[model samples]
Target: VVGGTEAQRNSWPSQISLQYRSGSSWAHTCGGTLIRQNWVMTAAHCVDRELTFRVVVGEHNLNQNNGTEQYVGVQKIVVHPYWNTDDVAAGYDIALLRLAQSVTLNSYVQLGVLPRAGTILANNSPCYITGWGLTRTNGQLAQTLQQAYLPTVDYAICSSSSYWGSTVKNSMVCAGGDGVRSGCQGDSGGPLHCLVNGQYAVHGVTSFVSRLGCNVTRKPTVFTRVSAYISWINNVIASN
Candidate 1:
């Protein structure tokens, strides 16, 4: 049992505010982690508007909605080389974006550590996931930052024949459910974080479809396992 009412968990300020123009309206794509002064990590699907995308660092809120949002244009967009919208590669949905301008570091926004492979996430790991996504399936997207906790599920349990069928992959991890907590649409690209030795580390990236109502028993919320991609991530960062 990981998730609770939104009020129970403490909200950590997000490092980046991803904004883009949808039609004629400016809307948020999703939140991102600031790995470097000019680099951010987010979901590949969120990069729909490569030219119009912007990242705002050092923010506590989306607008007057809570905190200040600094805007920077997207200079480069790189999705996982093997990412595919269809088929197995769809599960490898991760991406990195280079900000056009650098941002000054602040307490609200800081770099997070990456987990190592072979590390197992146990149930009730005190994990936290934050986003400004929708609160409910048919509800409007949230303008304020919100967070939820997730319980790590055993791979066998998550990939059971009674669940998502063959959709779940090894490159992904599952969390959420107990018929109470969950990550919904629009939460995609947000971080599934865990604190170790007093520092926050990104354990996963919100990356799948669960039950329609947000919380559904046995419906596992999937995320891209960051640890497995560390080498590729390092290479990308080095080449840039």
Candidate 2:
């Protein structure tokens, strides 16, 4: 993420590195959250391309051998029916992937807790955007995971003309429009963890930033509000 700091090794255990096979090595594509031992939550756009994918749990540094890491193949993927790649602003960007096998939980890897259905954080509520996205608008990905304190920018303000306009929907969450710290390329499909009732819960699936730039003024990072898809998520997991 732009203007972020290296995240502590065990600070966000649910954070995962979503990678795709590239020649002789795998390349990190996006970030995702481990919602269950076998299921991962990410943005549909992250997997729209046809490619082999895998998940790396407990990863702290991409180039370092973190003994805690667990590599697993993706068995199946389910993109939200309403998701349209051409129109991300329309907001059905969420998706789920069923892992080839269930991962063992440990201090460095665990499931991310989801926020209660229909839950919405108050304006400027405390939250963090974690990922291995770019360190700048057109920069390279970081070797280590990064996190930025991104406060919630309520819908009313985020939907204003100067902000994201009407493109910011109720089914999405906006944060970090400060034009400094925000999610950039490679960070999509990551989690927007918010502190509510003394606990951090996965409230959003990183969706988009402005085409103008990664950290643009009044253009906060937008995310698919996870609470809006609780029923859909549960249904997919149950039927799949």
* Model 2 lDDT per residue over 129-198, tens place: 9999889988899999999999999999999999988899999999999989999999999999999888
- lDDT tens readout by residue for model 1, 23-71: 8756776767777777888877777445488786655445463344566
Each candidate's clash count: 1, 0
Question: TM-score of every model?
Answer: 0.87, 0.99
Q: Which residues of candidate 1, in runs, are more than 4 Å off?
A: 1-14, 23-25, 48-51, 63-67, 88-90
Single out the weakest 10-residue window by summed lDDT for candidate 1: 1-10
**All models: lDDT?**
0.70, 0.95
Candidate 2 to truth, TM = 0.99
